[PDB]
Amino acid sequence: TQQPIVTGTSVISMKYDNGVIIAADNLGSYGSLLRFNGVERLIPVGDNTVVGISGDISDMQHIERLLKDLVTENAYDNPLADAEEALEPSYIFEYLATVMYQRRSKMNPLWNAIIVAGVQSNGDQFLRYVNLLGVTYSSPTLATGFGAHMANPLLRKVVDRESDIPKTTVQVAEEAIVNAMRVLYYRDARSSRNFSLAIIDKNTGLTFKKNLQVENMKWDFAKDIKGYGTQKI
Amino acid sequence: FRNNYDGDTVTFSPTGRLFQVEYALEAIKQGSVTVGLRSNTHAVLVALKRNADELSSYQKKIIKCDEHMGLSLAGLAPDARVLSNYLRQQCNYSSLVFNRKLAVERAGHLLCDKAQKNTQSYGGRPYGVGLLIIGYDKSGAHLLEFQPSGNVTELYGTAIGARSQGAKTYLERTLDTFIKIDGNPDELIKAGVEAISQSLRDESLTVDNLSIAIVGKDTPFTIYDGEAVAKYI
Amino acid sequence: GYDRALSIFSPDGHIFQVEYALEAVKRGTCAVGVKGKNCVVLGCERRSTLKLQDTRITPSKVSKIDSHVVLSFSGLNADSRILIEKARVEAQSHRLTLEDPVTVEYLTRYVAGVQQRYTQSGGVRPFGVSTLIAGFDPRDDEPKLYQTEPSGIYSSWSAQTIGRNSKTVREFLEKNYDRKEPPATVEECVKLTVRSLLEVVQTGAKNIEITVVKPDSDIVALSSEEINQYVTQIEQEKQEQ
Amino acid sequence: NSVFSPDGRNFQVEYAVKAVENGTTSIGIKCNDGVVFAVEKLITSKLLVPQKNVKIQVVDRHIGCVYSGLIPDGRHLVNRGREEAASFKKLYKTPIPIPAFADRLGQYVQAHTLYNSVRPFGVSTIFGGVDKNGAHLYMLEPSGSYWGYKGAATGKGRQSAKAELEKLVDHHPEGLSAREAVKQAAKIIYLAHEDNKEKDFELEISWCSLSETNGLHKFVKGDLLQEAIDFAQKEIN
Amino acid sequence: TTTLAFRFQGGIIVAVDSRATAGNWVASQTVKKVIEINPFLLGTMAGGAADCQFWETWLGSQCRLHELREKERISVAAASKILSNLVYQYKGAGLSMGTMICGYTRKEGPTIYYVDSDGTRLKGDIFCVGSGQTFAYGVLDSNYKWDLSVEDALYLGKRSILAAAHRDAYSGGSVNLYHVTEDGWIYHGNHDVGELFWKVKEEEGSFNNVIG
Amino acid sequence: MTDRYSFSLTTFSPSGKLGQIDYALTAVKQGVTSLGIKATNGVVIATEKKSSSPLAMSETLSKVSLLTPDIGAVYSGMGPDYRVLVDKSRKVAHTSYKRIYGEYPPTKLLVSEVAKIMQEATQSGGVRPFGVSLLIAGHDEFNGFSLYQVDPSGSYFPWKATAIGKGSVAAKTFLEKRWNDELELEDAIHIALLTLKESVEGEFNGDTIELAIIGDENPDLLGYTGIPTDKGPRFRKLTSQEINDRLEAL
Amino acid sequence: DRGVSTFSPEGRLFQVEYSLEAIKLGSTAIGIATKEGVVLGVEKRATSPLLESDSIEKIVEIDRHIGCAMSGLTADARSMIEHARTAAVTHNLYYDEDINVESLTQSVCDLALRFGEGASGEERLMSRPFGVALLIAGHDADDGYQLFHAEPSGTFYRYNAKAIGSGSEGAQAELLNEWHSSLTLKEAELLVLKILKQVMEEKLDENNAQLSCITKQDGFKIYDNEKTAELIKELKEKEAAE
Amino acid sequence: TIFSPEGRLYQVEYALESISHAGTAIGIMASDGIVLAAERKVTSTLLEQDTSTEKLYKLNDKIAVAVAGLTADAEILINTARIHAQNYLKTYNEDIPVEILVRRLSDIKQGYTQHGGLRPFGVSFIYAGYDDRYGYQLYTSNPSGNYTGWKAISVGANTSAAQTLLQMDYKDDMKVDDAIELALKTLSKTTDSSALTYDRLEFATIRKGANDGEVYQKIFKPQEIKDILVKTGIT
Ligand SMILES: Cc1ccccc1CCC(=O)N[C@H](C(=O)N[C@@H](CCc1ccccc1)C(=O)NCc1ccccc1Cl)[C@@H](C)O
Ligand SMILES: [Mg+2]
Ligand SMILES: [Mg+2]
């Protein structure tokens, strides 16, 4: 028993040639009430990892605190905490996947769908998903909720398999992400125009972009639409 | 001053000494010698195994803790079993939860904290075993020395047990040479067998006598006994 | 709540508390058991000191554990009741689960385990009791006799004795018990059992009590009158030379 | 432990203090916007790996702890302090204030002087950091006693260290920067080592400063450390 | 599933099918529904495969433990009561098992105990258990005699399982046969219903609702 | 954290003494005198307020305590032990009796409960016996008036009159000389005052003496009217002025 | 007498040392490992001639491939045997195989450690160490025939041959001279019988001494009284001819 | 709770030692009743006799005890014994047979003798009861938890002297009135005080319901003791 109250919608992501991109809009919905508008659902952990969370926002806030406590705990008695023994994306993920699976097993889930994005210390891109059931999987593209249905097909047109990854630039990947965010804004009734986007590059590091907006929207064609069948005026 | 002050680990002497701890320290000196040393690429344990009789096995001094970590023992052997099992569990927990190999340094801290609790609890005794811990983690080769007082120190080389003062002086003398035996397992082991020799009023070291272990850059922790040590005698 | 160690090792290798428990047995009234060809007889002495007792109601030393097995003891009377109760419970439990009464060896092994456990547990002292357990295995005619002691050691005996002056009666039994010619029947088995007590009791009126066990749950106590006739014939016969 | 002497003393605690006095010397210095911590690390043998037996410990992100006496007892105290700081932050969201944290440790150390089944801690601990209202430095004895300090020292070199600290308080009543206080810490440790000149030593420094570390606890390493070592080597001769 | 065991002049016959199902899906045709606990003890399985496999394997362990403890083979009465009592502890939790414990001891003679997950435990000469039980009963009961030869009694067991394998959608595969004596369990082979049916029809002249 | 004395601290000595109970009784002997006298229509319990400082305010510390509306107590020995015993006695009157039978316990049974609490401190692990003797005076419908003594061992005895503490032997002697079975309450109060004067060094007035009675019902102390079968507490602490009034014609 | 788990100034555990003394007071038990089996023999030592000697159980089966002989405070050995049997059967249940002899021994030695009170780390349900030692003989596929000496200290050694109990000093020196890697099971049987004969107070017959072995083919067997008697004849005739 | 090198339980022995200083209590079993008599520990004129019971307690309608030792220890045990009798009544719908109650109490004492590090109860009991299996019964239990049955028995001070006197004058065919006399004579002879007066005694009988077929416990009021003390010729 448990049910989500305040929620966040899609988290979408993909691998490009040198890293990962992840985005989520800034809305906290309360059923059909678009209740909160400055909600950050991208959580940087160190400078190699961003965790994207959708689902229940109270559980998201709980997971934020777990992530922060994990940075604290790793720094304890660790002279290499900002070098060789810094938290890796894969460490953060395995931790979360453990928590998620334990909580579902106790019949008390964290009502979330989570994407961990980042770069390993050897330069490898890391992109993995975990949800309220402890189900985990990895793919060149990952998305949650509506993003799964609508962003993935668009993103998969760019990175359809492993070999497509060396062929994909930051510019191309970000363009695809930004476009998929527009599509989501067109068709998801729980989406917002404002979103955050983060790039984690093996050369550039972490670029966190706040207060992005869907631009270049097509609405003009609406004027020609009259009635629902026979009506002419 | 030593009279009424050594009945338990929960009493300080008027000098500020804990005699039960000091007595536990004394069981290590009663133990058969073992040597540890490392270069930048490998770490080696060398141990003199001891038989009860000429009809008997020679008792094991080396225990594997994980693929990248193991230890040698001097003192109460059943205490080494208790502490290595704990260490195996800590190694395990780290892999399962965080997908992370336990830092040799953290293994040191965990052993220290465990020993400490027994130097302060009524009804219990301190551990009566010294341990030498080798491993290869994300910052290379490591050697540790554990005293059941809870003091753990990181060293390039060391020895514990009866007559170990010889081997220690030897290593102290050879420091600049063995630290640089990189990429050569056989030379590093040779220098370890060399070191344990300075601790023999015993005799010649035989094929039943000798126990060697190695871990390193591309070598999991591995124990050599019997016929497999002959090429070092 | 309290589990501090009271039973520990001595420099020379003994457990003092177990050894001192044996001393408590030594001072308890004597008990004896001998087995015939088709029976086992158990005898116990009652002390001279107090003889204004009510014999109807005073707990006797021979106790039925089940309908085919008996137990007697020497040592602390109060300690014996704890062992007897647990043994009785185990007997019913065994009938419940295996659908068969206990063997004499099984019951003994169980009582002995209880005794042993009280020698390695914190905050408890050993039982100041040694026991003689006797009876017949279900559907068996071969008589059984076992002895347990505070340590938890147990073994079988053709005849045995425990308690004060047991050394004397053991000596008597060692001379008078023949293994290839064991007491042919109940009467001569009872007689030998009474003779061995007469070495230690020194008027032995209702001071000696006897219980006879036969195959298939046939267990009977002997009355004053029935014992009297045994004592009478013993000293009357053993006079001439 | 739970035992008062006929004149109100606790011999066991007094004996625990002896273990502390037997320890390596450690100090803390409170500057105008932070705190500095230094400690003497005895080099028993060339075999000890340099820089790799770290004594100074962080609690949360804004607190440093150093101690003299039984090292394991100190680690035990820092584990507890970490549980205690996490518990505070979990409920109150804000990182634990230094005085708040001081009492947490204090009450814990004091508890180990109440019961016959326990021994007092064999350490004195110097600790502190920056909070909502400035720098704080503390020292905590085996009895659980603790006060705020302008500067503090414990262990074998304690008397000479306290003398040097006392001079600084007189010559600089108007505060004293974090960068100076680091230099001066290296100095005081060097002067305190005079006692133990038979064995060589290694210096460890950490600091927490509002302007120099942004109120976070940070180990002094690299050039900053070497500069402080050069200053101490210079001023000893 | 169909399983049976019956007592006769010359001991005990035990016979079982080898079909495993999940709903209407046939999971396996070659499953082992007899557990050989010891050289004198057999257990049969019906119901939940896991529940049966797991607890009758466990039973074997408990039986072996009795041997070491008491220096004697466990009675059939007692082996069955161990399983009966365990299963009774689990009552209402949803265990699903229909079980026969069959064997020989000196004291008991040949003995069969039926034990199920409701906690019922019964001693008797003839039991059929499983979804096919009624079919097995039909053939077994109408041809059972105490004085059957060993060869005939083995055949009746075999024939009764085939009957159930024919009519019960949830039985089939093969027959596994056992004979229990004084010295007692002897395996009498695996018999694939594929061949056995046509063979038995041919030689016996039975099964006349079948074409070909 | 955890107790290392899970064994009895009161044990038998070779001669049969229970040392700690004997030593507790010695502590009671050094205590300030308290006493109780039973009359035909009342009981009086009395004691001296020996003050620790004249800067102290002796009214803030009562030695005479209400336990139930019809039961009061006084003590000799260690005050703090008394204070906590009164708490537990008040509570046990409710938990073991009033919450069950909807009425207050009769005197003997409450005394019985207190005695149990003291007995347990005599057998339990890791504790010393209470260093007090109590006098408990009460009334109840079916037993009339009564007076009990309770000792560190948990023993209780019914008394017509008795004294405990310092000058108890002389006071018990003075009471045997003066007591009879026709005493009215005012007579018992008078004797209580006389007996107490021999035991009191300093000033002897309503500010230095403490006195209470178990008499008849005080409807004016009930706090409410309208239920006729509720008539008010029989326990009554005498005021300083009430005491001084009786000390004039003493 | 202060603590049950106190170190001496030399660094030894008092109570552990004294339990080893209790073992020296026990009946002699001898084990000899060959490539054709492992022989276990014990001195029965009846305290009186009325004791029925065959009720003396100092050799016990643990599993078909593992047996053991005991010496010392023999009542202490019951719960150790129970644990051993459970561990072996449980292993077979969990793993459909025989437990390794070395693993079985390590299990029994873990149980031996569980004395004290709790020991700030786990939990202890025993007030004193066991006052008994075990010789554990068996076969497994990896290491063949094996002999282990399980001590209440929690340590255990593998031996080619081993004596425990009151005659162990004399018997061990004897075993040092007589043992060789080529011994047959029959030669081992005879040696055990010979060395018991030497150290025993009483005259060795089939009633005051007991023999057993463990072979891969037939498992663990306690020889009955007729079989040992015939082996005693054979020893009498062998020595008398030398 | 530990053993001596002699095989004795120190604390039990010392508890027994303490009991031999308590007021003597005597029980005598006759064919038609039981007598319980006990001497109060030297008192005062000011002790309330009418509401005092330090030695004689009712366990149920058919069973009573006489106490020697610590009263507070005894009340603890009496209370559990009372509860135990009612549990039995509730379970079986029959009054508890006397031995069953005695055994249980004796087992509680034995326990303190064997585990827990607590001191034993410094108490000896004489139990006087009736049931339809053994009729009138008399038992005794001490701090060891041992218990025995008797026709006549004493506990507390001077048990040795009291026992000899009872052994002398007791006869199986006695009536209750003869037993009343014997108990008072024996106490008179063994007292450590001037005269055995009413104020120093507790007395009780278990007869046959005055006239009924039932069993009646009479716990003598002070006046009745004074009367029965003159009748037997000790005034
Ligand atoms: C109990 C459960 C929990 C969660 C998920 C699934 C399940 C049931 C799994 C199942 O049905 N398993 C099958 C089974 O037991 N089938 C039974 C028949 C269906 C059934 C009846 C009653 C209860 C549960 C299931 C069977 O073949 N039984 C015959 C059998 C076969 C092999 C060994 C022993 C036996 Cl008895 C096996 C074959 O895959
Ligand atoms: Mg200081
Ligand atoms: Mg079918």
Coordinates of C-alpha atoms in Angstrom, one line a residue, chain D residues 101-191:
Chain D
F101 CA 28.1 18.9 18.1
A102 CA 30.5 19.5 21.1
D103 CA 27.8 18.6 23.6
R104 CA 26.9 15.5 21.6
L105 CA 30.4 14.2 22.0
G106 CA 30.6 15.5 25.6
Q107 CA 27.4 13.6 26.7
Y108 CA 28.7 10.5 25.1
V109 CA 32.2 10.7 26.7
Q110 CA 30.5 11.5 30.1
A111 CA 28.3 8.4 29.8
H112 CA 31.4 6.2 29.8
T113 CA 32.2 7.6 33.3
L114 CA 28.9 6.4 34.9
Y115 CA 28.9 2.6 34.8
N116 CA 31.2 -0.1 36.3
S117 CA 30.9 -2.2 33.1
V118 CA 32.7 0.5 31.0
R119 CA 36.0 2.4 30.8
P120 CA 36.4 6.1 30.1
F121 CA 37.9 7.0 26.7
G122 CA 41.7 7.1 26.4
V123 CA 41.7 10.3 24.3
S124 CA 41.5 14.0 24.4
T125 CA 39.9 15.4 21.2
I126 CA 40.4 18.8 19.6
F127 CA 37.7 19.6 17.1
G128 CA 35.7 22.4 15.6
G129 CA 34.6 24.2 12.4
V130 CA 32.5 27.0 11.0
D131 CA 28.7 27.4 11.4
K132 CA 25.9 30.0 11.1
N133 CA 27.7 32.3 13.5
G134 CA 31.4 31.9 13.1
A135 CA 34.4 29.7 14.0
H136 CA 34.5 27.5 17.1
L137 CA 37.3 25.4 18.5
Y138 CA 36.8 22.8 21.3
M139 CA 38.8 20.4 23.5
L140 CA 37.2 17.4 25.2
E141 CA 38.9 15.4 28.0
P142 CA 38.3 11.7 29.1
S143 CA 35.9 13.0 31.8
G144 CA 33.6 14.5 29.2
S145 CA 34.7 18.1 30.2
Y146 CA 34.9 20.5 27.2
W147 CA 35.1 24.2 26.7
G148 CA 35.6 26.6 23.8
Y149 CA 39.2 27.6 23.1
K150 CA 41.2 30.3 21.4
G151 CA 43.9 27.7 21.0
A152 CA 44.4 24.2 22.3
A153 CA 47.0 21.4 22.6
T154 CA 47.1 17.9 24.0
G155 CA 49.5 15.0 24.2
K156 CA 53.2 14.8 25.2
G157 CA 54.2 18.3 23.7
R158 CA 51.2 19.9 25.3
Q159 CA 53.0 22.3 27.8
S160 CA 55.4 23.9 25.2
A161 CA 52.5 24.0 22.7
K162 CA 50.3 25.9 25.2
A163 CA 53.1 28.3 25.8
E164 CA 53.4 29.1 22.1
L165 CA 49.6 29.4 21.8
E166 CA 49.5 31.8 24.8
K167 CA 52.1 34.1 23.1
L168 CA 50.0 34.3 19.9
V169 CA 46.9 35.3 21.8
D170 CA 48.9 38.2 23.4
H171 CA 50.6 39.4 20.2
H172 CA 47.4 39.2 18.0
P173 CA 44.3 40.2 20.0
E174 CA 42.6 41.5 16.8
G175 CA 41.9 38.2 15.1
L176 CA 44.8 36.5 12.9
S177 CA 44.2 35.1 9.4
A178 CA 43.6 31.4 8.3
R179 CA 46.8 31.6 6.2
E180 CA 48.9 32.8 9.1
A181 CA 47.3 30.3 11.6
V182 CA 48.3 27.4 9.2
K183 CA 51.9 28.6 9.2
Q184 CA 51.9 29.1 12.9
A185 CA 50.5 25.6 13.5
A186 CA 53.3 24.0 11.6
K187 CA 55.7 26.0 13.8
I188 CA 54.1 24.9 17.1
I189 CA 54.1 21.3 16.1
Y190 CA 57.8 21.6 15.3
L191 CA 58.7 23.2 18.6

